[PDB]
Coordinates of C-alpha atoms in Angstrom, one line a residue:
Chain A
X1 CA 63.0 -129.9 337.3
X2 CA 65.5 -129.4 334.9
X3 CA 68.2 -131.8 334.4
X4 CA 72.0 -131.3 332.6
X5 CA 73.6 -134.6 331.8
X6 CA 77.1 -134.4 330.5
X7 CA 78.9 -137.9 329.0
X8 CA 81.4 -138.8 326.7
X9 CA 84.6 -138.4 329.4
X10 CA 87.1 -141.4 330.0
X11 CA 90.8 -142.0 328.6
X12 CA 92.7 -140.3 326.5
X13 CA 96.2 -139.9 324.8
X14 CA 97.8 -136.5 324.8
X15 CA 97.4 -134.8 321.4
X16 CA 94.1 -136.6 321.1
X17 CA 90.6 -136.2 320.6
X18 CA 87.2 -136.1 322.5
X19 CA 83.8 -135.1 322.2
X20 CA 81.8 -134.4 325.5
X21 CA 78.0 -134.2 325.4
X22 CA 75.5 -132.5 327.7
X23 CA 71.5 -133.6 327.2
X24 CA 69.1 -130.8 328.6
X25 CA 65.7 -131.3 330.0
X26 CA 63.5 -129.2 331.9
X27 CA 63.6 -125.9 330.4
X28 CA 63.0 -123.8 327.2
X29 CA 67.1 -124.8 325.7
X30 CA 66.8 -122.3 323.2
X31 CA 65.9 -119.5 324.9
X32 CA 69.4 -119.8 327.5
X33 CA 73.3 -119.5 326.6
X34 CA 74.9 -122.6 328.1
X35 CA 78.5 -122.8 329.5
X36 CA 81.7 -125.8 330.3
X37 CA 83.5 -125.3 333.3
X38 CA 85.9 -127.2 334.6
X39 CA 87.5 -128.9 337.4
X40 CA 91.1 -130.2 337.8
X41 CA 92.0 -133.0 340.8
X42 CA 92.1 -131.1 344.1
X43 CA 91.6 -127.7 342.2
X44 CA 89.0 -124.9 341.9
X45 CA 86.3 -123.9 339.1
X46 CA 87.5 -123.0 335.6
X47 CA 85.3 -121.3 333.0
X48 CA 86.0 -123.1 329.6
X49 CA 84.1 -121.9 327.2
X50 CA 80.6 -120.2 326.7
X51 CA 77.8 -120.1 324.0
X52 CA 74.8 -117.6 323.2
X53 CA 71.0 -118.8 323.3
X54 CA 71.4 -118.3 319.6
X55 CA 74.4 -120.5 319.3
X56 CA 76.3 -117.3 317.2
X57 CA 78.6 -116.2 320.0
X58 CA 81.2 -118.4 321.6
X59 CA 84.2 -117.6 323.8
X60 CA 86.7 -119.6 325.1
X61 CA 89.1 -119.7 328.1
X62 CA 92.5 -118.4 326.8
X63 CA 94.3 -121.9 327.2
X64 CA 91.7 -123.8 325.3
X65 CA 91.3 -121.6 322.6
X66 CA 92.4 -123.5 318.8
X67 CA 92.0 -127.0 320.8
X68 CA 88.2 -126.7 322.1
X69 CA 84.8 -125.8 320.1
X70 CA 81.8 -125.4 321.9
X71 CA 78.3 -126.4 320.2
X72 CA 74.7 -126.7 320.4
X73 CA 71.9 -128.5 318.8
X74 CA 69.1 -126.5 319.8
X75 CA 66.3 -128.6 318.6
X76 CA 67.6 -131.9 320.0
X77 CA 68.4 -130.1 323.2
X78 CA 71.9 -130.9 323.2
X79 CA 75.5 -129.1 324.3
X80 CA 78.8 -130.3 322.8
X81 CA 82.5 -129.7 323.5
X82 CA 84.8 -130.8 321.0
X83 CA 88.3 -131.2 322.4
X84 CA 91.4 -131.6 320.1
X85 CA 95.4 -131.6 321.1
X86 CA 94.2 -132.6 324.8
X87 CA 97.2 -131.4 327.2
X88 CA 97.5 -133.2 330.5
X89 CA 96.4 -129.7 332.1
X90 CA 93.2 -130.6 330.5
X91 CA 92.3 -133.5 332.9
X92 CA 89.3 -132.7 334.6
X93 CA 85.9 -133.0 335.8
X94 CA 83.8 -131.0 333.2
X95 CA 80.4 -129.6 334.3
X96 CA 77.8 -128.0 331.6
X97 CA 76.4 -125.0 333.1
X98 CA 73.2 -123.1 332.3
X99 CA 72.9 -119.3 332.6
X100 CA 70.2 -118.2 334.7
X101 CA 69.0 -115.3 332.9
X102 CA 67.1 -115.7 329.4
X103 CA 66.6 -112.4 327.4
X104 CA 69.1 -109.7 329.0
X105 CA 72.2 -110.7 327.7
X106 CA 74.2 -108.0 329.9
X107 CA 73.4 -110.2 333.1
X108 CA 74.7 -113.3 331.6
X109 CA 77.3 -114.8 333.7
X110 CA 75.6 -116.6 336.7
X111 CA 75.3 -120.5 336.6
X112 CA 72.0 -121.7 338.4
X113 CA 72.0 -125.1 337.2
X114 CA 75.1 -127.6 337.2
X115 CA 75.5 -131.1 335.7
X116 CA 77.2 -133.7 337.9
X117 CA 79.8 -133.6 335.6
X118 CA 81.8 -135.8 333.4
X119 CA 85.4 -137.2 334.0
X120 CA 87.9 -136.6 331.5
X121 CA 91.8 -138.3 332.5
X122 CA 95.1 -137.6 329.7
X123 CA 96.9 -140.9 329.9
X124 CA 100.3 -142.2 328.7
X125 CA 99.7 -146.0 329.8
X126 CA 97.3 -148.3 332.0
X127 CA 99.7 -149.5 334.9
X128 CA 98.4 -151.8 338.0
X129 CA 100.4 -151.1 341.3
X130 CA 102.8 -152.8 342.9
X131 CA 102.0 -153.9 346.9
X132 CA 104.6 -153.6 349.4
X133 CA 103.6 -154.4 353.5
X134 CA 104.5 -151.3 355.8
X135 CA 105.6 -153.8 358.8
X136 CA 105.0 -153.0 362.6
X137 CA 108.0 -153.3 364.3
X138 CA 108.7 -153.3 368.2
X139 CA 109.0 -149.4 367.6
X140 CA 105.7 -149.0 369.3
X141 CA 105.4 -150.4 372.8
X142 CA 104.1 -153.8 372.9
X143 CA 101.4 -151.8 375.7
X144 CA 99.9 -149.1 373.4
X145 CA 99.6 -148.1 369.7
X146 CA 100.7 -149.9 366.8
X147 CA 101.0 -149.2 363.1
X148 CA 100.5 -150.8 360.3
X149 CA 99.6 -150.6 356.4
X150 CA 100.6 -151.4 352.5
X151 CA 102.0 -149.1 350.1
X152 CA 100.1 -149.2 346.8
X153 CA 102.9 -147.9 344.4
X154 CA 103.0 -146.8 340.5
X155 CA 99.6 -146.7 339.0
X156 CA 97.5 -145.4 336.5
X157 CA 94.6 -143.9 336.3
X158 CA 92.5 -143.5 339.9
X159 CA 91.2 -145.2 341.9
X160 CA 92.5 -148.0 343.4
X161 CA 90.3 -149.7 346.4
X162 CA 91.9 -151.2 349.3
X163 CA 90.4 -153.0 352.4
X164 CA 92.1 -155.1 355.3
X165 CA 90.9 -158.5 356.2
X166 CA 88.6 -158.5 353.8
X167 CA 86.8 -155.8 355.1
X168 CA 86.4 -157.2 358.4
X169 CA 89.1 -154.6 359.7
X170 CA 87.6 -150.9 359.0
X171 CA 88.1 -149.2 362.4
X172 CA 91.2 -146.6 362.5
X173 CA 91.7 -147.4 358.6
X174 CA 93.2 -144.0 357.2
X175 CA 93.5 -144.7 352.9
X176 CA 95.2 -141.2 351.5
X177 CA 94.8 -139.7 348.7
X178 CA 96.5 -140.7 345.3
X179 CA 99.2 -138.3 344.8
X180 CA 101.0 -138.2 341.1
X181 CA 104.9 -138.9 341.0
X182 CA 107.1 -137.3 339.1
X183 CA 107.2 -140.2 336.7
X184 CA 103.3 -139.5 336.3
X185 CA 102.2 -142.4 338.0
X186 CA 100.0 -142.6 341.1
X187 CA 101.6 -143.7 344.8
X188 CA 99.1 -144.1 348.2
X189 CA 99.4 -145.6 350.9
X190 CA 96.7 -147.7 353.4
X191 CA 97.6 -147.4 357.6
X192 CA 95.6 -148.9 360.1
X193 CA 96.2 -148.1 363.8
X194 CA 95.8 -151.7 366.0
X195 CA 96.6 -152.3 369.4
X196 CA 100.3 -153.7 370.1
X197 CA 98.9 -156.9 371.7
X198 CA 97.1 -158.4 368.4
X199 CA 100.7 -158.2 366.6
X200 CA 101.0 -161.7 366.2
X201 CA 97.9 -162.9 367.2
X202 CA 95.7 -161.0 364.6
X203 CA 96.5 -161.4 361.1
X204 CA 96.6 -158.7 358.8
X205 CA 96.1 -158.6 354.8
X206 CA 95.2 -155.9 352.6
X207 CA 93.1 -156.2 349.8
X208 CA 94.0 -153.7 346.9
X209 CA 91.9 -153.8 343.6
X210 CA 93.1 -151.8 340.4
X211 CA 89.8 -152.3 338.0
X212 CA 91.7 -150.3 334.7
X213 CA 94.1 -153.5 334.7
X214 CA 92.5 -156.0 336.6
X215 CA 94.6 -156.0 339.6
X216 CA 94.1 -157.7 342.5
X217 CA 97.0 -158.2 344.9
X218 CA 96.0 -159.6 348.7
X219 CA 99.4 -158.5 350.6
X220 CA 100.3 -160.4 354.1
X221 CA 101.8 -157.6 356.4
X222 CA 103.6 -159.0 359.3
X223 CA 105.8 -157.8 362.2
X224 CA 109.9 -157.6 361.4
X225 CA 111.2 -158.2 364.8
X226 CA 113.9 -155.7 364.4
Chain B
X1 CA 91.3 -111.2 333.3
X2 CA 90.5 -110.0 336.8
X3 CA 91.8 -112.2 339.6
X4 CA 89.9 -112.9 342.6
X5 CA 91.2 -113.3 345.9
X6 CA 89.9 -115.4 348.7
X7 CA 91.5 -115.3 351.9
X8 CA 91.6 -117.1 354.1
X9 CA 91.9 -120.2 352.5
X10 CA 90.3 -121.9 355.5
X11 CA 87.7 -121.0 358.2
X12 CA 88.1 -123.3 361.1
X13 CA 83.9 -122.8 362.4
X14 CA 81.7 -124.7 364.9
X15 CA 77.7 -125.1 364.5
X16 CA 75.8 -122.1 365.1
X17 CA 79.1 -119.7 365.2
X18 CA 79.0 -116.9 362.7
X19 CA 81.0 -117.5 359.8
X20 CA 82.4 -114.8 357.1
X21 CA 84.1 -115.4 354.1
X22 CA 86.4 -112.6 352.3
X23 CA 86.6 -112.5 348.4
X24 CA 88.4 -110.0 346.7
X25 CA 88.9 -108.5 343.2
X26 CA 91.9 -106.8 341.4
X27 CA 89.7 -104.4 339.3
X28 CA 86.1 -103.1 340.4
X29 CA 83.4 -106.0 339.3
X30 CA 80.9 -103.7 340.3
X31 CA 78.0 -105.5 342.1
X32 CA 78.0 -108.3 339.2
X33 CA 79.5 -110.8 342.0
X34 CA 78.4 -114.6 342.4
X35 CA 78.8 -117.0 345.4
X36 CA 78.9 -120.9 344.9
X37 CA 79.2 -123.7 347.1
X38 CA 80.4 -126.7 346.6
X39 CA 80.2 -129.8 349.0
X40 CA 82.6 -133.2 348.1
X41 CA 81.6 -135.2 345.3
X42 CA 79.0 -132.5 344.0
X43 CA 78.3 -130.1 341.3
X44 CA 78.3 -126.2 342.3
X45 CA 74.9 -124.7 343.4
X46 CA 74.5 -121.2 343.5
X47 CA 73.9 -119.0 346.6
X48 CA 74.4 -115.5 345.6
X49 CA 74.1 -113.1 342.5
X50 CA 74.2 -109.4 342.3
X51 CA 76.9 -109.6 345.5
X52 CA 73.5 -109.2 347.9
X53 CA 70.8 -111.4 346.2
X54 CA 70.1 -114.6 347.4
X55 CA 69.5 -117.7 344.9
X56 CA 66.3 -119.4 344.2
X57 CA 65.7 -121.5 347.7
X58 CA 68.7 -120.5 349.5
X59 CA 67.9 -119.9 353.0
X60 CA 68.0 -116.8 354.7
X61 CA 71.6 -117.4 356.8
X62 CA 73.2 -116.5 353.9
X63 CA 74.1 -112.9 353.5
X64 CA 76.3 -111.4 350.8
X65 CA 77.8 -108.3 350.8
X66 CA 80.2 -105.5 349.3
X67 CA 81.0 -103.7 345.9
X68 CA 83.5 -103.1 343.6
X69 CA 86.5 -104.6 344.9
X70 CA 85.5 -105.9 348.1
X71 CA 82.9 -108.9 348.9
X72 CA 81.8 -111.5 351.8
X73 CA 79.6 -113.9 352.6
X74 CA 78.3 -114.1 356.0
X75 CA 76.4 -117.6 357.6
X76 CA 74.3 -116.0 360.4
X77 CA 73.9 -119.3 362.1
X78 CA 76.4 -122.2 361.0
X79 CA 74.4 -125.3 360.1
X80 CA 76.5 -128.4 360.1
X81 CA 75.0 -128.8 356.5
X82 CA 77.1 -125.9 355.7
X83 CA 80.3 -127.1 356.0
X84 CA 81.4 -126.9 352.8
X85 CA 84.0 -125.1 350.0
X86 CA 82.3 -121.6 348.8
X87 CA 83.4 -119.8 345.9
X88 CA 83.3 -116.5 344.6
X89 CA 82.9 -115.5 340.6
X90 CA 82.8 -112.1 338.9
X91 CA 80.5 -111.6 335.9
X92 CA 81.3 -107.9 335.4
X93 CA 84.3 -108.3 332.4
X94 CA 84.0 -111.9 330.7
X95 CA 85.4 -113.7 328.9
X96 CA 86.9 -114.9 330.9
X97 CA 84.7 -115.7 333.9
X98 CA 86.8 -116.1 337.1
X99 CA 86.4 -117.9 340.6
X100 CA 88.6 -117.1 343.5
X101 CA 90.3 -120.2 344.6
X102 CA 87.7 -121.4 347.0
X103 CA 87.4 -120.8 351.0
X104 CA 87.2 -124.0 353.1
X105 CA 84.7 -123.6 356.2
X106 CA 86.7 -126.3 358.0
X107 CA 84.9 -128.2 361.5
X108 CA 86.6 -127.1 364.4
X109 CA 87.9 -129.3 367.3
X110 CA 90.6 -128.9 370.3
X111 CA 94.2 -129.1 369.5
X112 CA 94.6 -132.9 369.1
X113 CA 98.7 -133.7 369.0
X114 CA 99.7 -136.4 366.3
X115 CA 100.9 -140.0 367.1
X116 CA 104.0 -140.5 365.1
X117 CA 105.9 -143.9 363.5
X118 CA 107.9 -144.4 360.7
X119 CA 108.1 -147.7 358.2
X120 CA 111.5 -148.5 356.5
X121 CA 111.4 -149.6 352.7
X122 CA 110.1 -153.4 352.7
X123 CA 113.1 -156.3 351.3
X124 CA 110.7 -156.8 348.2
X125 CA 110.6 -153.2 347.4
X126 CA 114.4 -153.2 347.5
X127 CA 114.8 -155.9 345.7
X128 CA 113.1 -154.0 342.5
X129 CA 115.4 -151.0 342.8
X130 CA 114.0 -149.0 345.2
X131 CA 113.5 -147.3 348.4
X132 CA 110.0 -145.9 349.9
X133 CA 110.6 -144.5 353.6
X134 CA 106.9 -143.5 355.2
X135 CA 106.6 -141.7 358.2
X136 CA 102.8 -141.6 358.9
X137 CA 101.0 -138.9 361.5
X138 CA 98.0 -140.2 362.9
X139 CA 94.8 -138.0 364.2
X140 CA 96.1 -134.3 364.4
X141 CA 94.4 -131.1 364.4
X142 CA 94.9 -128.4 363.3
X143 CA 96.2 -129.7 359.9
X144 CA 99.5 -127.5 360.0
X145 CA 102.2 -130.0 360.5
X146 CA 106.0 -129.7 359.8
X147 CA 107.9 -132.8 358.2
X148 CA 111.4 -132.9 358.1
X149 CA 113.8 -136.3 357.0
X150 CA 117.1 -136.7 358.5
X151 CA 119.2 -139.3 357.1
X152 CA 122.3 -139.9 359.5
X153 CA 121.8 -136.2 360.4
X154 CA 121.6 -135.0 357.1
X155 CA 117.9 -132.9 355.9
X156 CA 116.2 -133.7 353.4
X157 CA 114.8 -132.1 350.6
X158 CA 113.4 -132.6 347.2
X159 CA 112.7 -136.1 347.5
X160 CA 109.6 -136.8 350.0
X161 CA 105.8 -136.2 349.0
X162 CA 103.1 -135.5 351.3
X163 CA 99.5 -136.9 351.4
X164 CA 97.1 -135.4 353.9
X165 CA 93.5 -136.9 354.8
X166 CA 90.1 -135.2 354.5
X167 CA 88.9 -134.6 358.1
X168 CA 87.9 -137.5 359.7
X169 CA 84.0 -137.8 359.6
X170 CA 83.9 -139.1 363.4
X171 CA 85.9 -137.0 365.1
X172 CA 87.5 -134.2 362.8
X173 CA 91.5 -134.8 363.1
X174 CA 93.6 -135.0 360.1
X175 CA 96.5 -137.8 359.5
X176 CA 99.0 -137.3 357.2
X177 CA 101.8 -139.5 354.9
X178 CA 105.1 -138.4 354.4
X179 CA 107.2 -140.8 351.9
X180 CA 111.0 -140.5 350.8
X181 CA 111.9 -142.1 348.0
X182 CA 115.2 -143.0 347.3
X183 CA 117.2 -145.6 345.0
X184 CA 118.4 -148.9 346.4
X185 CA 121.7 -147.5 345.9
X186 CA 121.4 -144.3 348.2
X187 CA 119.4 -146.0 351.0
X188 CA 122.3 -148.5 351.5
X189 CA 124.9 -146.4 352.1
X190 CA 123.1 -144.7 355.1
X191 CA 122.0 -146.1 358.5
X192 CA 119.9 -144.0 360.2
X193 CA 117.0 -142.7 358.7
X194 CA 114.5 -140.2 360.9
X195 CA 111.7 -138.2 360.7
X196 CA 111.2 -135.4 363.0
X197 CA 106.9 -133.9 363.3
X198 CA 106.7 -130.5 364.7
X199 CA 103.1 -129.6 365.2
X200 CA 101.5 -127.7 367.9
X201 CA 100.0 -130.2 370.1
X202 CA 103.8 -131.6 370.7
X203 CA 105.2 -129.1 373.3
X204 CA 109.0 -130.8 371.7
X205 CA 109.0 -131.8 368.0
X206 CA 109.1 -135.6 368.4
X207 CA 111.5 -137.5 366.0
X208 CA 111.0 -141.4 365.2
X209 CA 113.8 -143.1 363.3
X210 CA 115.4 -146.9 362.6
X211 CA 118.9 -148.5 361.6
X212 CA 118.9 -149.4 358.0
X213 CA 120.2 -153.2 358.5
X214 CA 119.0 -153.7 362.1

């Protein structure tokens, strides 16, 4: 089985610096050229950057080119991406690649072999989220469907985790997906779908945990009455 | 670079239906065309190389097809393990290598209309400065839904963002989040704030709304 490990993503500044690693098992390294590609949040692929079996030909994507240098240590069976003057278009999951064809260098281009792939985020500062209750209100019949839910509000980076009831309540829980504000900051909401007879009687608390600034916030939501 | 097309964006498909998946290329590529899929939370595998030649272990429903500027990919018989995003890459002029922009095979399901309420901006949220307004579709398919605010009669634009859900695991339907955000300053000198869903399971776009102080 061969096996492609990337590591070295996390955090970091725009303008700055890092150094992503991909450890290769499983096959003869030398004898294969070895490829990043890329993958921005809710995206497609990207080809970054590529490098011969012999290590003396590199390209680049045109957008990376001056701020990324691809690199191999062929007899410690390693891949490296150096990335310098990171833009926030940069922020990724990175994947090494491995071409499936040895010795005909005109049929290089296919990728048989992907590694899970390593996260990298550009960040301007670690924010928790504020928590604010999205109340039921007599809006829904008090004989069908209500709503209810909390509204987990300027953060950064992903993810933040929310239950209800301390995960006692998990049926009809919809959690969206983080979406970036203009300010650069993440905004989501958590809605849950009860009926409109346990207003009042059922209690209802949602449980958000931010673990990048050790957030925890446990927010009563409760019905307005107009 | 050579830009490649794939349309249609999503392929609504049930098990065992016949599913075919169009990629496209702005200059000839020759028969040096790849196919990837690519499943949530996973690294691409490869399916198909050389446009027609199936990857080690793929299994025979997958077909590929075409030249020069014109390519599919065709699943005989739709597995539920095949629901998935499938990508198509040229090899013929690199650097650069590029992907078309992906084809969802999406799981189909009847027309399921959307159940529709709206949250005003909570007092503590005020209280900082600002005002979120959330209108919230619940379990909808298909995922095409129309949003509009209306703030004392007024539309909206500009100011709302949407969120939409990965289809539900259970039973397929999409909900979506639609959220206004306005300063504490603008929401208070406006009382009714509405939000009107026009989707095709509603045979009349359905509008939910509140009074700001009431």
């Amino acid at each position: 089985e061969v096996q492609l490990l990337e590591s070295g993503g996390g955090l970091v500044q725009p303008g700055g610096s890092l150094r992503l690693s991909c450890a290769v098992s499983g096959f003869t390294f030398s004898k294969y050229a070895m490829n990043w590609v890329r993958q921005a949040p809710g995206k497609g692929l990207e080809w970054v950057s590529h490098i011969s079996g012999s290590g003396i030909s590199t390209y680049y994507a045109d957008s990376v080119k001056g701020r990324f240098t691809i690199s191999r240590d062929t007899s410690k069976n390693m891949l490296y991406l150096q990335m310098n003057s990171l833009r926030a278009e940069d922020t990724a999951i990175y994947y090494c690649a491995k071409d499936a064809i040895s010795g005909q260098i005109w049929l290089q281009g296919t990728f048989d072999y992907w590694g899970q792939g390593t996260l990298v985020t550009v960040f301007n500062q670690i924010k928790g989220p504020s928590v604010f209750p999205l109340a039921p209100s007599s809006k829904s019949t008090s004989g069908g469907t209500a709503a209810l839910g909390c509204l987990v509000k300027d953060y950064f980076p992903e993810p933040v985790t929310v239950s209800w009831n301390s995960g006692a309540l998990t049926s009809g829980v919809h959690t969206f997906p983080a979406v970036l504000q203009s300010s650069g900051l993440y905004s989501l909401s958590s809605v849950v779908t009860v009926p409109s007879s346990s207003l009042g009687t059922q209690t209802y608390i949602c449980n958000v945990n931010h673990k990048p600034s050790n957030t925890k916030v446990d927010k009563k939501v409760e019905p307005k009455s107009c | 670079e050579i830009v490649m097309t794939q349309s249609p964006a999503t392929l609504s498909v049930s098990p065992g239906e016949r599913a075919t998946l169009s990629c496209r290329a702005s200059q000839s590529v020759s028969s040096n065309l790849a196919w990837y899929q690519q499943k949530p939370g996973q690294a691409p595998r490869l399916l198909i190389y050389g446009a027609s030649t199936r990857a080690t272990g793929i299994p025979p429903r997958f077909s590929g097809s075409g030249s020069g500027t014109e390519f599919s990919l065709t699943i005989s018989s739709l597995q539920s393990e095949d629901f998935a995003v499938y990508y198509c890459q040229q090899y013929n002029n690199w650097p650069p290598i590029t992907f078309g922009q992906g084809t969802r095979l999406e799981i189909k399901r009847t027309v399921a209309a959307p159940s529709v309420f709206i949250f005003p901006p909570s007092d503590e949220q005020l209280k900082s400065g600002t005002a979120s307004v959330v209108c919230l579709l619940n379990n909808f398919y298909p995922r095409e839904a129309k949003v509009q605010w209306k703030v004392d009669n007024a539309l909206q634009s500009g100011n709302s963002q949407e969120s939409v859900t990965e289809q539900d695991s259970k039973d397929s339907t999409y909900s979506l989040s639609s959220t206004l955000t306005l300063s504490k300053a603008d929401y208070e000198k406006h009382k009714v704030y509405a939000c009107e869903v026009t989707h095709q399971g509603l045979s009349s776009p359905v509008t939910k709304s509140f009074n700001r102080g009431e």
